[PDB]
Protein backbone atom coordinates (compact mmCIF):
# COMPACT_ATOMS: atom_id res chain seq x y z
CA UNK A 1 0.00 0.00 0.00
CA UNK A 2 1.17 3.52 -0.86
CA UNK A 3 2.05 6.04 1.85
CA UNK A 4 -0.06 9.16 1.33
CA UNK A 5 1.46 11.43 4.01
CA UNK A 6 5.18 11.83 4.74
CA UNK A 7 6.61 11.13 8.16
CA UNK A 8 6.13 13.89 10.73
CA UNK A 9 9.84 13.60 11.47
CA UNK A 10 11.96 16.02 9.43
CA UNK A 11 13.31 14.16 6.39
CA UNK A 12 15.58 15.39 3.59
CA UNK A 13 15.23 13.70 0.20
CA UNK A 14 18.28 14.28 -2.01
CA UNK A 15 18.12 14.01 -5.81
CA UNK A 16 20.71 14.08 -8.57
CA UNK A 17 20.88 13.34 -12.26
CA UNK A 18 18.86 14.03 -15.42
CA UNK A 19 19.12 17.64 -16.62
CA UNK A 20 15.99 16.94 -18.67
CA UNK A 21 14.04 16.25 -15.47
CA UNK A 22 15.96 18.82 -13.37
CA UNK A 23 13.78 21.89 -14.18
CA UNK A 24 10.57 20.03 -13.37
CA UNK A 25 12.15 18.65 -10.20
CA UNK A 26 12.81 22.25 -9.13
CA UNK A 27 9.05 22.82 -9.33
CA UNK A 28 8.09 19.57 -7.59
CA UNK A 29 10.48 20.07 -4.67
CA UNK A 30 9.38 23.48 -3.36
CA UNK A 31 5.65 22.81 -3.82
CA UNK A 32 5.86 19.53 -1.89
CA UNK A 33 8.00 21.37 0.67
CA UNK A 34 5.47 24.22 0.82
CA UNK A 35 2.87 21.58 1.75
CA UNK A 36 5.14 19.55 4.08
CA UNK A 37 7.70 21.93 5.61
CA UNK A 38 9.50 19.15 7.50
CA UNK A 39 10.40 17.55 4.14
CA UNK A 40 13.52 18.96 2.44
CA UNK A 41 14.19 18.24 -1.25
CA UNK A 42 17.50 19.01 -2.96
CA UNK A 43 18.11 18.58 -6.68
CA UNK A 44 21.10 18.66 -9.02
CA UNK A 45 21.47 18.60 -12.78
CA UNK A 46 24.26 16.09 -13.40
CA UNK A 47 22.99 13.81 -16.15
CA UNK A 48 21.33 10.41 -16.01
CA UNK A 49 24.73 8.74 -15.83
CA UNK A 50 25.40 10.32 -12.45
CA UNK A 51 21.76 9.82 -11.44
CA UNK A 52 22.00 6.05 -11.91
CA UNK A 53 25.48 5.72 -10.37
CA UNK A 54 24.74 7.80 -7.27
CA UNK A 55 21.38 6.11 -6.68
CA UNK A 56 23.06 2.70 -6.97
CA UNK A 57 25.88 3.76 -4.63
CA UNK A 58 23.34 5.16 -2.17
CA UNK A 59 24.66 8.72 -2.15
CA UNK A 60 21.21 10.15 -2.93
CA UNK A 61 17.66 8.99 -2.33
CA UNK A 62 16.46 9.77 -5.87
CA UNK A 63 18.47 9.19 -9.02
CA UNK A 64 16.85 10.95 -11.96
CA UNK A 65 17.37 9.24 -15.30
CA UNK A 66 15.75 9.38 -18.72
CA UNK A 67 17.06 5.83 -19.26
CA UNK A 68 15.69 2.69 -17.63
CA UNK A 69 18.12 0.43 -15.83
CA UNK A 70 19.67 -2.40 -17.80
CA UNK A 71 19.22 -5.91 -16.46
CA UNK A 72 22.91 -5.80 -15.53
CA UNK A 73 22.16 -2.72 -13.41
CA UNK A 74 19.31 -4.53 -11.65
CA UNK A 75 21.48 -7.62 -11.17
CA UNK A 76 24.44 -5.67 -9.79
CA UNK A 77 22.40 -3.43 -7.45
CA UNK A 78 20.00 -5.29 -5.16
CA UNK A 79 16.73 -3.46 -4.59
CA UNK A 80 17.34 -0.77 -7.24
CA UNK A 81 14.37 0.08 -9.47
CA UNK A 82 13.33 2.70 -12.02
CA UNK A 83 9.96 4.29 -11.22
CA UNK A 84 8.24 6.21 -14.01
CA UNK A 85 7.28 9.75 -12.98
CA UNK A 86 6.22 11.47 -16.22
CA UNK A 87 6.60 11.33 -20.00
CA UNK A 88 9.16 13.58 -21.67
CA UNK A 89 10.47 13.89 -25.21
CA UNK A 90 13.50 15.11 -27.15
CA UNK A 91 13.76 17.50 -30.07
CA UNK A 92 16.54 17.94 -32.59
CA UNK A 93 17.59 21.60 -32.70
CA UNK A 94 19.66 23.23 -35.40
CA UNK A 95 21.22 26.62 -36.13
CA UNK A 96 19.97 27.71 -39.57
CA UNK A 97 18.71 31.31 -39.35
CA UNK A 98 17.68 31.57 -43.00
CA UNK A 99 15.23 28.64 -42.90
CA UNK A 100 11.84 29.15 -41.26
CA UNK A 101 10.40 25.68 -41.94
CA UNK A 102 10.54 22.90 -39.37
CA UNK A 103 13.07 20.78 -41.27
CA UNK A 104 12.20 17.10 -41.62
CA UNK A 105 14.93 14.68 -40.54
CA UNK A 106 15.09 10.95 -39.82
CA UNK A 107 17.51 8.51 -38.23
CA UNK A 108 19.35 7.61 -41.43
CA UNK A 109 20.07 11.24 -42.28
CA UNK A 110 20.98 12.13 -38.69
CA UNK A 111 23.22 9.05 -38.46
CA UNK A 112 25.05 10.12 -41.64
CA UNK A 113 25.32 13.68 -40.29
CA UNK A 114 26.85 12.38 -37.07
CA UNK A 115 29.04 9.98 -39.05
CA UNK A 116 30.37 12.81 -41.22
CA UNK A 117 29.18 11.60 -44.63
CA UNK A 118 26.50 14.30 -44.90
CA UNK A 119 28.72 17.40 -44.74
CA UNK A 120 26.52 20.33 -45.84
CA UNK A 121 22.93 21.23 -45.00
CA UNK A 122 22.00 21.21 -48.71
CA UNK A 123 23.13 17.61 -49.14
CA UNK A 124 20.69 15.82 -51.48
CA UNK A 125 19.71 13.39 -48.71
CA UNK A 126 18.41 16.33 -46.66
CA UNK A 127 16.79 18.08 -49.63
CA UNK A 128 15.07 14.77 -50.43
CA UNK A 129 13.13 15.09 -47.15
CA UNK A 130 12.51 18.85 -47.58
CA UNK A 131 11.65 19.57 -51.22
CA UNK A 132 11.36 23.26 -52.01
CA UNK A 133 13.17 24.35 -48.83
CA UNK A 134 16.01 26.90 -49.16
CA UNK A 135 18.73 24.70 -47.66
CA UNK A 136 22.07 26.55 -47.45
CA UNK A 137 25.54 25.20 -48.15
CA UNK A 138 26.38 25.67 -44.46
CA UNK A 139 28.44 22.87 -42.95
CA UNK A 140 26.79 20.36 -40.64
CA UNK A 141 28.29 20.60 -37.15
CA UNK A 142 27.03 17.61 -35.10
CA UNK A 143 26.98 18.16 -31.34
CA UNK A 144 26.67 15.43 -28.73
CA UNK A 145 26.64 15.33 -24.95
CA UNK A 146 30.01 15.03 -23.22
CA UNK A 147 28.63 13.73 -19.92
CA UNK A 148 26.82 10.44 -19.42
CA UNK A 149 23.34 11.42 -20.55
CA UNK A 150 19.85 9.99 -20.82
CA UNK A 151 19.35 12.25 -23.83
CA UNK A 152 22.25 10.49 -25.55
CA UNK A 153 20.51 7.23 -24.60
CA UNK A 154 17.26 8.28 -26.31
CA UNK A 155 18.92 9.79 -29.38
CA UNK A 156 21.22 6.86 -30.11
CA UNK A 157 18.34 4.46 -29.53
CA UNK A 158 16.56 6.45 -32.25
CA UNK A 159 19.58 6.28 -34.58
CA UNK A 160 19.95 2.54 -33.95
CA UNK A 161 16.31 1.67 -34.57
CA UNK A 162 16.17 3.79 -37.74
CA UNK A 163 19.60 2.62 -39.01
CA UNK A 164 20.00 -0.91 -37.60
CA UNK A 165 22.58 -2.09 -40.14
CA UNK A 166 24.67 1.08 -39.74
CA UNK A 167 24.50 3.08 -36.51
CA UNK A 168 22.74 0.19 -34.77
CA UNK A 169 25.75 -2.02 -35.47
CA UNK A 170 28.18 0.73 -34.44
CA UNK A 171 28.42 2.74 -32.29
CA UNK A 172 25.03 1.63 -30.95
CA UNK A 173 23.21 3.25 -28.04
CA UNK A 174 23.83 4.03 -24.39
CA UNK A 175 24.27 6.82 -21.88
CA UNK A 176 27.86 6.90 -23.19
CA UNK A 177 28.49 6.39 -26.90
CA UNK A 178 31.65 6.41 -29.06
CA UNK A 179 30.46 9.23 -31.29
CA UNK A 180 32.61 9.57 -34.43
CA UNK A 181 35.16 12.38 -34.40
CA UNK A 182 34.10 14.06 -37.63
CA UNK A 183 35.20 17.65 -38.33
CA UNK A 184 33.33 20.18 -36.24
CA UNK A 185 31.97 17.57 -33.84
CA UNK A 186 31.98 18.65 -30.19
CA UNK A 187 30.78 17.28 -26.88
CA UNK A 188 28.75 19.66 -24.72
CA UNK A 189 28.02 19.34 -21.00
CA UNK A 190 24.36 19.08 -20.03
CA UNK A 191 21.26 20.12 -21.96
CA UNK A 192 22.22 23.74 -21.35
CA UNK A 193 25.57 23.17 -23.02
CA UNK A 194 23.78 21.80 -26.07
CA UNK A 195 21.55 24.87 -26.32
CA UNK A 196 24.48 27.26 -26.05
CA UNK A 197 26.77 25.16 -28.25
CA UNK A 198 24.11 24.86 -30.94
CA UNK A 199 23.47 28.63 -30.85
CA UNK A 200 27.22 29.36 -30.97
CA UNK A 201 27.88 28.45 -34.60
CA UNK A 202 25.56 28.28 -37.63
CA UNK A 203 25.06 24.77 -38.98
CA UNK A 204 25.10 23.03 -35.60
CA UNK A 205 22.70 20.15 -34.96
CA UNK A 206 22.02 19.00 -31.41
CA UNK A 207 19.71 16.58 -29.62
CA UNK A 208 18.12 18.56 -26.79
CA UNK A 209 15.55 17.55 -24.20
CA UNK A 210 12.10 19.09 -24.37
CA UNK A 211 12.39 20.84 -21.00
CA UNK A 212 14.93 23.05 -22.82
CA UNK A 213 12.88 23.61 -25.99
CA UNK A 214 11.65 27.04 -24.85
CA UNK A 215 15.23 28.16 -24.22
CA UNK A 216 16.36 26.71 -27.56
CA UNK A 217 13.70 28.54 -29.59
CA UNK A 218 14.37 31.77 -27.69
CA UNK A 219 17.96 31.48 -28.96
CA UNK A 220 16.65 31.35 -32.54
CA UNK A 221 17.32 27.65 -33.07
CA UNK A 222 15.18 25.63 -35.44
CA UNK A 223 13.09 22.65 -34.33
CA UNK A 224 12.91 19.56 -36.53
CA UNK A 225 10.05 17.28 -37.46
CA UNK A 226 11.41 13.80 -36.77
CA UNK A 227 10.46 10.75 -38.81
CA UNK A 228 9.26 7.46 -37.41
CA UNK A 229 9.66 4.11 -39.14
CA UNK A 230 6.07 4.37 -40.43
CA UNK A 231 7.23 7.19 -42.71
CA UNK A 232 5.56 10.21 -41.09
CA UNK A 233 7.33 13.28 -39.70
CA UNK A 234 6.29 14.75 -36.36
CA UNK A 235 6.97 17.74 -34.18
CA UNK A 236 7.15 17.02 -30.42
CA UNK A 237 3.89 18.02 -28.75
CA UNK A 238 0.86 16.87 -26.78
CA UNK A 239 -0.68 14.97 -29.70
CA UNK A 240 2.35 13.20 -31.14
CA UNK A 241 3.82 12.50 -27.69
CA UNK A 242 0.51 11.18 -26.33
CA UNK A 243 -0.02 9.19 -29.52
CA UNK A 244 3.38 7.51 -29.17
CA UNK A 245 2.97 6.86 -25.45
CA UNK A 246 -0.52 5.46 -26.05
CA UNK A 247 1.24 3.01 -28.36
CA UNK A 248 3.07 1.82 -25.23
CA UNK A 249 0.20 1.83 -22.73
CA UNK A 250 -0.89 -1.79 -22.50
CA UNK A 251 2.53 -3.35 -23.14
CA UNK A 252 4.27 -1.36 -20.39
CA UNK A 253 6.02 -3.94 -18.16
CA UNK A 254 5.58 -4.17 -14.41
CA UNK A 255 9.14 -2.98 -13.79
CA UNK A 256 8.53 -0.08 -16.25
CA UNK A 257 11.89 -0.61 -18.00
CA UNK A 258 10.72 -0.12 -21.59
CA UNK A 259 11.99 1.75 -24.64
CA UNK A 260 9.33 3.88 -26.37
CA UNK A 261 11.66 5.08 -29.13
CA UNK A 262 10.28 5.07 -32.69
CA UNK A 263 7.05 3.41 -31.65
CA UNK A 264 4.55 1.66 -33.91
CA UNK A 265 2.05 4.53 -33.71
CA UNK A 266 1.99 6.14 -37.18
CA UNK A 267 1.22 9.55 -35.63
CA UNK A 268 3.61 9.01 -32.71
CA UNK A 269 6.63 11.18 -32.04
CA UNK A 270 9.66 8.85 -32.25
CA UNK A 271 11.74 10.18 -29.29
CA UNK A 272 9.68 10.00 -26.10
CA UNK A 273 10.55 8.45 -22.77
CA UNK A 274 9.52 7.81 -19.20
CA UNK A 275 11.22 10.03 -16.64
CA UNK A 276 12.55 7.65 -14.00
CA UNK A 277 13.33 7.91 -10.33
CA UNK A 278 16.15 5.42 -9.77
CA UNK A 279 15.47 4.44 -6.15
CA UNK A 280 16.24 1.57 -3.78
CA UNK A 281 13.58 -0.43 -1.96
CA UNK A 282 15.48 0.00 1.35
CA UNK A 283 16.05 3.48 2.75
CA UNK A 284 18.10 4.20 5.87
CA UNK A 285 15.12 4.38 8.26
CA UNK A 286 11.35 4.01 8.31
CA UNK A 287 10.69 7.77 8.26
CA UNK A 288 12.71 8.35 5.08
CA UNK A 289 10.95 5.36 3.49
CA UNK A 290 7.53 6.83 4.26
CA UNK A 291 8.49 10.34 3.12
CA UNK A 292 10.04 8.99 -0.08
CA UNK A 293 6.85 7.01 -0.75
CA UNK A 294 4.79 10.14 -0.07
CA UNK A 295 6.88 12.38 -2.33
CA UNK A 296 6.90 9.91 -5.23
CA UNK A 297 3.15 9.28 -4.95
CA UNK A 298 2.55 13.04 -4.86
CA UNK A 299 4.67 13.57 -7.99
CA UNK A 300 2.80 11.03 -10.12
CA UNK A 301 -0.49 12.53 -8.91
CA UNK A 302 -0.63 16.23 -7.98
CA UNK A 303 2.78 16.61 -9.61
CA UNK A 304 1.42 15.29 -12.90
CA UNK A 305 -1.19 18.06 -13.14
CA UNK A 306 -0.80 20.24 -16.22
CA UNK A 307 0.10 23.26 -14.07
CA UNK A 308 3.38 21.45 -13.41
CA UNK A 309 3.96 19.45 -16.60
CA UNK A 310 3.08 22.19 -19.11
CA UNK A 311 6.06 24.21 -17.83
CA UNK A 312 8.49 21.65 -19.31
CA UNK A 313 6.23 20.32 -22.09
CA UNK A 314 5.92 16.89 -20.44
CA UNK A 315 2.97 14.53 -20.56
CA UNK A 316 1.23 12.77 -17.66
CA UNK A 317 1.40 9.07 -16.97
CA UNK A 318 -1.74 7.31 -18.25
CA UNK A 319 -3.76 5.78 -15.40
CA UNK A 320 -2.50 2.25 -16.11
CA UNK A 321 1.12 3.39 -15.79
CA UNK A 322 0.19 5.34 -12.64
CA UNK A 323 -0.89 2.18 -10.85
CA UNK A 324 2.27 0.40 -12.02
CA UNK A 325 4.39 3.11 -10.39
CA UNK A 326 2.39 2.86 -7.16
CA UNK A 327 3.26 -0.84 -6.99
CA UNK A 328 7.01 -0.16 -7.03
CA UNK A 329 6.64 2.74 -4.58
CA UNK A 330 4.72 0.52 -2.16
CA UNK A 331 7.77 -1.75 -1.87
CA UNK A 332 9.95 1.13 -0.60
CA UNK A 333 10.65 -0.01 2.97
CA UNK A 334 13.48 0.11 5.53
Amino acid sequence: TVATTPASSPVTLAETGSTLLYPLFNLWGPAFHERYPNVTITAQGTGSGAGIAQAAAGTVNIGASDAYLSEGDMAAHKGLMNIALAISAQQVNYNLPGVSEHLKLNGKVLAAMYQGTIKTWDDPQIAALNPGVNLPGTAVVPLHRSDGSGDTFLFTQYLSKQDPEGWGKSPGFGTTVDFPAVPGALGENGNGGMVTGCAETPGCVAYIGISFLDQASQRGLGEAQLGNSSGNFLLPDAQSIQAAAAGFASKTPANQAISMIDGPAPDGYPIINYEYAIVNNRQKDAATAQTLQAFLHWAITDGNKASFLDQVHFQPLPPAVVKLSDALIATISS
Partner: antibody
Framework: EVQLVESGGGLVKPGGSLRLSCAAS????????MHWVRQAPGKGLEWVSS????????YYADSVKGRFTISRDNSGNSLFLQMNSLRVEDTAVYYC??????????????????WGQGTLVTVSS | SVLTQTPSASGTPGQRVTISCSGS????????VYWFQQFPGAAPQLLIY???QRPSGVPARFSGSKSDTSASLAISGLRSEDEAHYYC???????????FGGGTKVTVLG
Protein backbone atom coordinates in the same frame (compact mmCIF):
# COMPACT_ATOMS: atom_id res chain seq x y z
CA GLU B 1 28.24 -13.66 -41.73
CA VAL B 2 25.45 -14.49 -39.28
CA GLN B 3 24.85 -18.24 -39.04
CA LEU B 4 22.27 -20.15 -37.00
CA VAL B 5 22.42 -23.96 -37.00
CA GLU B 6 19.61 -25.99 -35.40
CA SER B 7 20.11 -29.56 -34.21
CA GLY B 8 18.50 -32.27 -32.11
CA GLY B 9 15.45 -33.03 -34.25
CA GLY B 10 14.09 -36.51 -34.82
CA LEU B 11 11.28 -38.84 -33.78
CA VAL B 12 9.36 -38.76 -30.48
CA LYS B 13 6.31 -40.64 -29.35
CA PRO B 14 3.17 -38.72 -28.35
CA GLY B 15 3.66 -37.63 -24.76
CA GLY B 16 7.46 -37.83 -24.95
CA SER B 17 10.01 -35.04 -24.84
CA LEU B 18 12.83 -33.64 -26.94
CA ARG B 19 15.37 -30.82 -26.55
CA LEU B 20 16.42 -28.69 -29.53
CA SER B 21 19.59 -26.61 -29.87
CA CYS B 22 20.63 -23.65 -32.00
CA ALA B 23 24.30 -22.72 -32.43
CA ALA B 24 24.83 -19.06 -33.33
CA SER B 25 27.81 -17.22 -34.77
CA UNK B 26 28.76 -14.09 -36.67
CA UNK B 27 27.36 -11.53 -34.20
CA UNK B 28 27.17 -10.68 -30.53
CA UNK B 29 24.68 -13.38 -29.54
CA UNK B 30 23.54 -11.77 -26.27
CA UNK B 31 22.55 -8.56 -28.11
CA UNK B 32 19.48 -10.12 -29.79
CA UNK B 33 16.18 -11.57 -28.69
CA MET B 34 16.21 -15.09 -30.13
CA HIS B 35 13.05 -16.81 -31.37
CA TRP B 36 11.84 -20.24 -32.39
CA VAL B 37 9.42 -20.54 -35.32
CA ARG B 38 7.96 -23.81 -36.59
CA GLN B 39 6.32 -25.00 -39.81
CA ALA B 40 4.28 -28.16 -40.26
CA PRO B 41 5.10 -29.80 -43.62
CA GLY B 42 3.17 -28.02 -46.35
CA LYS B 43 1.75 -25.46 -43.87
CA GLY B 44 2.45 -21.88 -42.82
CA LEU B 45 4.83 -20.41 -40.28
CA GLU B 46 3.82 -20.60 -36.62
CA TRP B 47 5.80 -18.60 -34.07
CA VAL B 48 6.71 -20.57 -30.94
CA SER B 49 8.72 -18.57 -28.42
CA SER B 50 11.27 -15.83 -27.78
CA UNK B 51 13.81 -14.97 -25.07
CA UNK B 52 16.40 -12.37 -24.16
CA UNK B 53 17.45 -13.86 -20.81
CA UNK B 54 16.10 -15.59 -17.71
CA UNK B 55 15.69 -12.15 -16.08
CA UNK B 56 13.53 -10.54 -18.79
CA UNK B 57 10.18 -11.21 -20.43
CA UNK B 58 9.79 -14.67 -21.99
CA TYR B 59 7.00 -15.33 -24.47
CA TYR B 60 5.26 -18.51 -25.62
CA ALA B 61 2.53 -19.16 -28.15
CA ASP B 62 -0.74 -20.32 -26.59
CA SER B 63 -0.39 -23.59 -28.50
CA VAL B 64 2.79 -24.51 -26.58
CA LYS B 65 2.54 -22.61 -23.28
CA GLY B 66 2.99 -24.88 -20.26
CA ARG B 67 4.72 -27.58 -22.33
CA PHE B 68 7.78 -25.81 -23.78
CA THR B 69 10.81 -24.13 -22.22
CA ILE B 70 12.92 -21.73 -24.23
CA SER B 71 16.33 -20.94 -22.81
CA ARG B 72 19.79 -19.88 -23.86
CA ASP B 73 23.46 -20.08 -22.89
CA ASN B 74 25.03 -16.75 -23.84
CA SER B 75 28.55 -17.96 -23.03
CA GLY B 76 28.29 -20.60 -25.74
CA ASN B 77 26.11 -18.87 -28.37
CA SER B 78 23.36 -21.42 -27.79
CA LEU B 79 19.56 -21.23 -27.86
CA PHE B 80 17.47 -24.14 -26.61
CA LEU B 81 13.91 -25.39 -26.97
CA GLN B 82 12.96 -28.17 -24.56
CA MET B 83 9.60 -29.69 -25.45
CA ASN B 84 7.41 -31.79 -23.17
CA SER B 85 4.15 -33.72 -23.55
CA LEU B 86 4.57 -33.49 -27.31
CA ARG B 87 1.59 -33.99 -29.59
CA VAL B 88 1.14 -35.18 -33.15
CA GLU B 89 0.31 -31.59 -34.14
CA ASP B 90 3.73 -30.47 -32.86
CA THR B 91 5.28 -32.22 -35.87
CA ALA B 92 7.07 -29.44 -37.76
CA VAL B 93 10.37 -28.11 -38.98
CA TYR B 94 11.64 -25.98 -36.10
CA TYR B 95 13.52 -22.84 -37.14
CA CYS B 96 15.85 -20.86 -34.93
CA UNK B 97 15.52 -17.17 -35.78
CA UNK B 98 17.35 -14.03 -34.71
CA UNK B 99 15.05 -11.22 -33.59
CA UNK B 100 15.32 -7.53 -32.84
CA UNK B 101 18.35 -5.98 -31.21
CA UNK B 102 18.32 -5.88 -27.39
CA UNK B 103 16.92 -2.41 -26.70
CA UNK B 104 14.88 -3.57 -23.69
CA UNK B 105 13.73 -6.84 -22.17
CA UNK B 106 10.01 -6.47 -22.94
CA UNK B 107 9.61 -5.97 -26.71
CA UNK B 108 9.43 -9.00 -29.01
CA UNK B 109 8.59 -7.91 -32.58
CA UNK B 110 9.04 -10.55 -35.35
CA UNK B 111 12.09 -8.72 -36.74
CA UNK B 112 13.53 -12.01 -38.04
CA UNK B 113 16.57 -10.98 -40.06
CA UNK B 114 18.34 -14.37 -39.85
CA TRP B 115 17.01 -17.93 -39.91
CA GLY B 116 18.55 -21.36 -39.62
CA GLN B 117 17.94 -24.26 -41.99
CA GLY B 118 15.51 -25.80 -39.48
CA THR B 119 15.41 -29.25 -37.88
CA LEU B 120 12.49 -31.63 -38.40
CA VAL B 121 10.63 -32.99 -35.37
CA THR B 122 8.22 -35.86 -36.03
CA VAL B 123 5.86 -36.85 -33.21
CA SER B 124 4.46 -40.29 -33.95
CA SER B 125 3.67 -43.69 -32.43
CA SER C 1 -3.02 -18.12 -39.12
CA VAL C 2 -4.47 -15.12 -37.29
CA LEU C 3 -3.62 -12.62 -40.05
CA THR C 4 -5.51 -13.06 -43.32
CA GLN C 5 -3.74 -13.23 -46.67
CA THR C 6 -5.13 -14.55 -49.91
CA PRO C 7 -3.76 -18.11 -50.27
CA SER C 8 -2.79 -17.55 -53.92
CA ALA C 9 -1.83 -14.50 -55.95
CA SER C 10 -0.64 -14.26 -59.53
CA GLY C 11 0.79 -11.71 -61.91
CA THR C 12 2.13 -11.42 -65.42
CA PRO C 13 5.85 -10.63 -65.82
CA GLY C 14 6.63 -6.95 -65.37
CA GLN C 15 3.47 -6.07 -63.44
CA ARG C 16 3.23 -5.03 -59.81
CA VAL C 17 1.57 -7.63 -57.57
CA THR C 18 0.03 -6.49 -54.28
CA ILE C 19 -0.45 -8.89 -51.35
CA SER C 20 -2.80 -7.68 -48.64
CA CYS C 21 -2.58 -8.73 -45.00
CA SER C 22 -5.61 -8.00 -42.84
CA GLY C 23 -5.34 -8.10 -39.05
CA SER C 24 -6.99 -6.33 -36.13
CA UNK C 25 -6.41 -3.46 -33.72
CA UNK C 26 -4.53 -5.79 -31.38
CA UNK C 27 -1.80 -6.90 -33.82
CA UNK C 28 -1.40 -4.87 -37.04
CA UNK C 29 -3.49 -2.03 -35.63
CA UNK C 30 -0.91 -1.44 -32.88
CA UNK C 31 2.39 -3.01 -34.01
CA UNK C 32 4.97 -2.91 -36.78
CA VAL C 33 4.40 -5.34 -39.66
CA TYR C 34 7.07 -7.69 -41.03
CA TRP C 35 7.15 -9.49 -44.38
CA PHE C 36 8.97 -12.70 -45.32
CA GLN C 37 9.77 -14.61 -48.50
CA GLN C 38 10.16 -18.39 -48.58
CA PHE C 39 11.19 -20.60 -51.48
CA PRO C 40 10.44 -24.33 -51.63
CA GLY C 41 12.88 -26.14 -49.37
CA ALA C 42 14.48 -23.02 -47.87
CA ALA C 43 14.05 -20.92 -44.75
CA PRO C 44 12.01 -17.71 -44.80
CA GLN C 45 13.97 -14.53 -45.48
CA LEU C 46 13.18 -11.04 -44.24
CA LEU C 47 11.76 -8.82 -46.99
CA ILE C 48 10.28 -5.80 -45.19
CA TYR C 49 10.52 -4.82 -41.54
CA UNK C 50 8.80 -2.11 -39.52
CA UNK C 51 6.00 -1.51 -42.06
CA UNK C 52 8.05 0.03 -44.87
CA GLN C 53 11.75 -0.51 -44.13
CA ARG C 54 13.81 -2.56 -46.60
CA PRO C 55 16.93 -4.51 -45.56
CA SER C 56 20.12 -4.07 -47.52
CA GLY C 57 20.28 -6.51 -50.41
CA VAL C 58 16.51 -6.64 -50.87
CA PRO C 59 15.78 -4.93 -54.21
CA ALA C 60 13.78 -1.71 -54.28
CA ARG C 61 10.92 -3.22 -56.31
CA PHE C 62 9.75 -4.84 -53.06
CA SER C 63 7.69 -2.32 -51.11
CA GLY C 64 5.47 -2.22 -48.05
CA SER C 65 2.71 -0.07 -46.62
CA LYS C 66 0.29 -0.05 -43.70
CA SER C 67 -3.25 1.28 -43.19
CA ASP C 68 -4.86 0.90 -39.75
CA THR C 69 -5.44 -2.84 -39.28
CA SER C 70 -4.15 -3.74 -42.75
CA ALA C 71 -0.76 -3.92 -44.45
CA SER C 72 0.36 -4.55 -48.02
CA LEU C 73 3.41 -5.94 -49.80
CA ALA C 74 3.97 -4.70 -53.36
CA ILE C 75 6.20 -6.63 -55.77
CA SER C 76 7.01 -4.30 -58.67
CA GLY C 77 8.43 -5.57 -61.95
CA LEU C 78 7.36 -9.14 -61.23
CA ARG C 79 9.95 -11.71 -62.28
CA SER C 80 9.97 -15.48 -62.59
CA GLU C 81 12.46 -15.55 -59.70
CA ASP C 82 9.71 -14.07 -57.48
CA GLU C 83 7.62 -17.27 -57.44
CA ALA C 84 7.50 -18.05 -53.72
CA HIS C 85 5.36 -17.92 -50.59
CA TYR C 86 5.01 -14.58 -48.79
CA TYR C 87 4.06 -14.30 -45.11
CA CYS C 88 3.13 -11.26 -43.07
CA UNK C 89 3.71 -11.13 -39.33
CA UNK C 90 3.22 -8.83 -36.36
CA UNK C 91 3.19 -8.76 -32.59
CA UNK C 92 -0.26 -9.17 -31.02
CA UNK C 93 -0.96 -7.17 -27.85
CA UNK C 94 -3.84 -9.40 -26.73
CA UNK C 95 -1.97 -12.69 -27.06
CA UNK C 96 1.45 -11.29 -26.17
CA UNK C 97 2.83 -13.37 -29.03
CA UNK C 98 3.72 -13.18 -32.69
CA UNK C 99 0.97 -13.84 -35.22
CA PHE C 100 1.52 -14.81 -38.85
CA GLY C 101 -0.59 -14.67 -41.94
CA GLY C 102 -1.28 -17.98 -43.65
CA GLY C 103 1.09 -17.15 -46.49
CA THR C 104 0.35 -16.14 -50.07
CA LYS C 105 1.60 -18.46 -52.80
CA VAL C 106 2.71 -16.25 -55.70
CA THR C 107 2.75 -17.67 -59.22
CA VAL C 108 4.35 -15.78 -62.10
CA LEU C 109 2.26 -16.40 -65.20
CA GLY C 110 3.68 -17.23 -68.62
Amino acid sequence: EVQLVESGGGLVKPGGSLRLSCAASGFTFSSHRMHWVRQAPGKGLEWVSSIISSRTYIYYADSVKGRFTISRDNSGNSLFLQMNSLRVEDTAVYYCARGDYYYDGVASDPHFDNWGQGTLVTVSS
Amino acid sequence: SVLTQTPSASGTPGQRVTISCSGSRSNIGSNYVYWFQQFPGAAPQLLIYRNIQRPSGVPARFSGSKSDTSASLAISGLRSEDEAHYYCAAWDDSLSGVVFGGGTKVTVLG
